[PDB]
Amino acid sequence: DEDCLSKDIKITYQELHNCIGPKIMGNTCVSKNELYSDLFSKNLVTEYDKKYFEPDTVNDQFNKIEFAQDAHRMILLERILYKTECEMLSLKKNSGPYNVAWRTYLKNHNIDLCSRHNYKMICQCINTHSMCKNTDIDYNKEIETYYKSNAAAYRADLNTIMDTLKTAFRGLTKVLIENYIEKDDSDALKALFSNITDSVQDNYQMIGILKFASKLLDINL
Ligand SMILES: *[C@@H]1O[C@H](CO)[C@@H](O[C@@H]2O[C@H](CO)[C@@H](O)[C@H](O)[C@H]2NC(C)=O)[C@H](O)[C@H]1NC(C)=O
Ligand SMILES: [Cl-]
Ligand SMILES: [Cl-]
């Protein structure tokens, strides 16, 4: 698994799936100077990169990634953010202010499916933080029946879920999501959601949200 900083200038959006925060992040948040010495000693950054390791707020790092016009720059800034910003580590778990952020944003303006069908697993996952393991399983295809009869609620709920995911995974993940959403690339979106799933297996509710998101993409209208 070659390092995202090792590879070439021409990078596909598909290869960038290896470089997203959830995947490169571990269980630690080192200082930026320690990450710089670490990557430098691996011949992955140079002194010309040192400016990218200076302190900055997390929102400004988000914007520097999400407006980046160079792929190597986007990869490096994502790596720095998710290796050095301690709050991001909460994404591998259930609790933390960063999880309550997207969690309350999602429950707040809920999805229309849950108004008339509060008993569906996705609705229990969103509202009561429970039953998140089975959110993609549609027993007797009741969820799919609902959406193809209420396309307004389908587009509203799909947009709400996409916005939830883009809020939870600022940076490269959000760039990729917006890219595929504009290209109408549902296969790529399901592949990205699958890749994220592999990296956040201990984020119960977020696993539920990703499963449900992939299910919604199967519902093709
Ligand atoms: C992320 O997930 C995607 C899809 O699950 C992976 O891409 C697939 O890899 C298999 C490996 O045999 C291929 O047969 C498929 O053609 C690939 N694409 C799809 C759409 O299934 C990918 O390997 C995962 N990891 C990344 C991108 O780092
Ligand atoms: Cl469960
Ligand atoms: Cl879990």
CB atoms within 10 A of CB 41: 9
State in Å: Cα 201 to ligand 3 middle: 6
Record the resolution, in angstroms.
2.1
State in Å: Cα 202 to ligand 3 middle: 4
> In the numeric block, which tokens belong to residue 29?
């948040």
Q: Could you tell me which residues come within 8 angstroms of residue 139 by beta carbon, excluding any fewer than 6 positions away?
A: none
CB atoms within 10 A of CB 21: 23
167 close to 160: Cβ distance less than 8 angstroms: no
Task: Tell me the best of 16, 194, 197, 198 to mutate to test the pocket of ligand 1, counting ligand atoms within 8 Å of each CB and taking the most.
Answer: 194
86 close to 93: Cβ distance less than 8 angstroms: no
Amino acid symbol at 28: T
Ligand at minimal distance from the CA of 200 is: 3
What is the rounded distance in angstroms from the CA atom of residue 221 to the CA atom of residue 216?
Answer: 10
H/E element holding 87?
none
Report the nearest-CA residue for atom 3 of ligand 1: 191
> In the numeric block, which tokens belong to residue 85?
């910003």
In the chain, beta strands by DSSP E: none
What is the rounded distance in angstroms from the CA atom of residue 110 to the CA atom of residue 100?
Answer: 15
Report the nearest-CA residue for atom 1 of ligand 1: 195
What is the rounded distance in angstroms from the CA atom of residue 37 to the CA atom of residue 45?
Answer: 9
Task: Indicate whether residue 17 lines ligand 1 (CB < 6 A).
Answer: yes
CA-23 nearest atom, ligand 1: 28
Ligand at minimal distance from the CA of 93 is: 3
**Helix ranges, 136-185 (H):** 142-149, 151-168, 172-183
